[PDB]
């Protein structure tokens, strides 16, 4: 006994959202903007003379790369990369609400074709944003539940 989804991915209260960040042209502020536009919410930027709309302020983005395995002579075999994002919803009237995200990826290494192994890292850090910008949207229904209590 199953039924199709009847609610909306983004709750019915935050359908007019204000985005704010420190780098309005970076990669994350493009990924999140496109992802939000996909779900139907209209984004009125450039904070104006309206006070009825929840906001969303992004935060610190960090990427770390380090060894994860070694061959039988000391060299490196696999690298591992991590991203961490932080954001705070700011529902008007009440207090702020923090959310987070985290992604994991890995890839092998090749010292003989290094240049080709530098155009594979770029694709990885370009497509990791599309998941770090989806976890945040998936965490949105939790905020409304903590707002109705």
Residues in contact with other proteins by the rule CB under 8 A = 1-6, 8, 23-26, 38, 40, 64, 66-78, 80, 82, 104-120, 123, 127, 131, 138, 141-142, 144-146
Stated as kind and residue range, the H or E segment containing 103 is strand 97-108
Closest contact distance (angstroms) between CB of 142 and other proteins is 4
How far is the C-alpha of 39 from the C-alpha of 148, rounded, in Å? 22
Closest contact distance (angstroms) between CB of 51 and other proteins is 26
User: Hey, is 94 helix, strand or coil?
Assistant: coil
In angstroms, the Cα distances linking 123 to 22, 51, 107, 111, 119 are: 24, 40, 12, 19, 7
Closest contact distance (angstroms) between CB of 92 and other proteins is 21
Closest contact distance (angstroms) between CB of 103 and other proteins is 9
Residue 96 or 146: the one with the smaller Cβ distance to other proteins is 146
Residue 51 or 64: the one with the smaller Cβ distance to other proteins is 64
Bridge partners, residue 42, by sequence: 16
How far is the C-alpha of 20 from the C-alpha of 142, rounded, in Å? 21
Residue 66 or 95: the one with the smaller Cβ distance to other proteins is 66
């Amino acid at each position: 006994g199953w039924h199709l989804r009847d609610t909306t991915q983004v709750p019915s209260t935050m359908k007019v959202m204000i985005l704010d960040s420190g780098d309005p042209n970076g990669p994350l502020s493009r990924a999140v903007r496109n992802q939000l536009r996909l779900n139907g919410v209209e984004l009125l930027d450039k904070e104006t003379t309206r006070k009825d709309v929840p906001s969303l302020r992004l935060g610190k983005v960090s990427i770390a790369k380090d060894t994860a395995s070694v061959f039988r002579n000391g060299q490196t075999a696999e690298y591992q990369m991590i991203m961490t994002v932080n954001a705070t919803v700011l529902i008007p009237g009440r207090d702020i609400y923090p959310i987070s995200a985290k992604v994991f990826r890995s890839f092998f290494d090749n010292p003989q074709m290094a240049l080709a192994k530098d155009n594979e890292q770029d694709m990885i850090v370009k497509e990791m944003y599309d998941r770090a910008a989806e976890q945040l949207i998936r965490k949105l229904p939790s905020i409304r539940a903590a707002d109705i209590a």
